[PDB]
Amino acid sequence: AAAAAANLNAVRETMDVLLEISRILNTGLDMETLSICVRLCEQGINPEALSSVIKELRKATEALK
Amino acid sequence: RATNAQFDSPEILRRLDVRLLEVSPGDTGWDVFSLDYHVDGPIATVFTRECMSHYLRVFNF
Amino acid sequence: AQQERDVRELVRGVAGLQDEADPNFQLALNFAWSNFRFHRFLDVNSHKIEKTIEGIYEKFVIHSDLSKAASWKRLTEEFLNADAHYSILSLLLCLSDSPSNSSYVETP
Amino acid sequence: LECSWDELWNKVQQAQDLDHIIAAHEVFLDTIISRCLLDSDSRALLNQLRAVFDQIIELQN
């Protein structure tokens, strides 16, 4: 009703905090990409696997350019 | 033992040892290196971790 | 179900491939699914990630950047009021780190 | 590293209490932080000084 829309507000400010922790660690994600990354980690998956995925996918758009 | 430091006390040369800080996947040896002088005895009362941190900062300079 | 739509959005976002009948997209989907369905990665421990957090706090202090270090610890204490913590933190950590960063906006 | 060493070596060798020698090393080290370019306000100064090291290392290439 009322709390179910302020709860996702309480998601947004945490999503803004991680937007600082992303840029002080120099990551290739932006704000839209990190939203998908939180949707990945809530279901449960090794982040070494995702990190190896992006560590290949980023080298497969600048190796063709 | 090539340099002069061999002739000083075994205790203070024993307290000189290398240390390495925490690593990053992007890294350079010049970025992560330190010499750490150990503090043993009750000498911790005279010298705290905060003065070690400032010691490390001026060493970085 | 939502994980599949998620991995499509992942390839779209990162690899910059918005064509899904492109064979490179489909090979990337096979690569993602085969990476996920054959894990050989160690399980994350909270204590090691805490040691990493304190270490990068030390690196921020050593290069004489006090306000960025204080904001770093401040933002971690605000973030940890939300398991999934350590997962996303270790993800950002391992994804990219190239040492003490020449960067600004320590008082935003 | 020399005016500070003089004031430290004076204020330890005359001092008769541990509370004096600790509080002398404290101000020794905080004056080292002030005289080196690692203060809060001199940060931009350091960020300028790093730029003149840049064109040093660049030159070797």
Element holding B18 (H helix, E strand): strand B16-19
Q: Could you give the CA distance from residue D46 to residue D36 in angstroms, rounded to a whole number?
A: 10
- Output the CA–CA distances (angstroms, integers) from residue C99 to A6, B37, C59, C72, D31, in the order listed: 37, 24, 8, 15, 29
For C2, the token pair is 């939502």
For B37, the token pair is 């002088």
Q: Does C27 touch chain A (CB under 8 A)?
A: no
- Output the CA–CA distances (angstroms, integers) from residue C64 to A37, B20, B44, in the order listed: 32, 18, 24
Reported structure resolution in angstroms:
7.0
For chain C, which residues lie within 8 Å of any Cβ of chain D, measuring from their own Cβ? 64-67
With CA atoms as reference, the chain A residue closest to C6 would be: A36
Residues 6+ apart with CB under 8 A from C3: A40, A43
Answer positive or negative: Cα dihedral of A18, A20, A25, A31.
positive
With CA atoms as reference, the chain B residue closest to C54 would be: B22
- Write out the E strands in chain D: none
CA distance B40 to chain C (A): 22
Q: Which residues of A touch C95 (CB under 8 A)?
A: 25, 27-29, 51, 54-55
CB A50 within 8 A of CB C32: no
Determine the residue type at D51. A
Contact A51 C94 (CB under 8 A): yes
Q: Could you give the CA distance from residue D46 to residue B54 in angstroms, rounded to a whole number?
A: 16
For D38, the token pair is 């690692």
Q: Could you give the CA distance from residue C100 to residue B26 in angstroms, rounded to a whole number?
A: 10
Return the bridge partners of D21, or none.
Answer: none
Contact call for A and D: 3+ CB–CB distances under 8 Å:
no
Element holding D41 (H helix, E strand): none
Q: How was this structure determined?
A: cryo-EM
User: Left, alpha or beta for C7 (phi > 0: left; psi -120 to 50: alpha)?
Assistant: alpha
Return the bridge partners of B35, or none.
Answer: B18
For chain B, which residues lie within 8 Å of any Cβ of chain D, measuring from their own Cβ? 46, 51, 54-55, 57-58, 61
Residue among C61, C64, C101 with most chain D CBs within 10 A, to mutate: C64
For A10, the token pair is 């309480």
With CA atoms as reference, the chain C residue closest to D51 would be: C102
Selecting from D22, D26, D32 the residue whose C-beta is nearest the C-beta of B58 gives D32
* Chain position carrying tokens 């240390």: B19
Q: Does A15 touch chain C (CB under 8 A)?
A: no
For D3, the token pair is 């005016």
Contact A43 C95 (CB under 8 A): no
**Residues counted in chain C:** 108
Q: Does D33 touch chain B (CB under 8 A)?
A: yes
CA distance D49 to chain C (A): 13
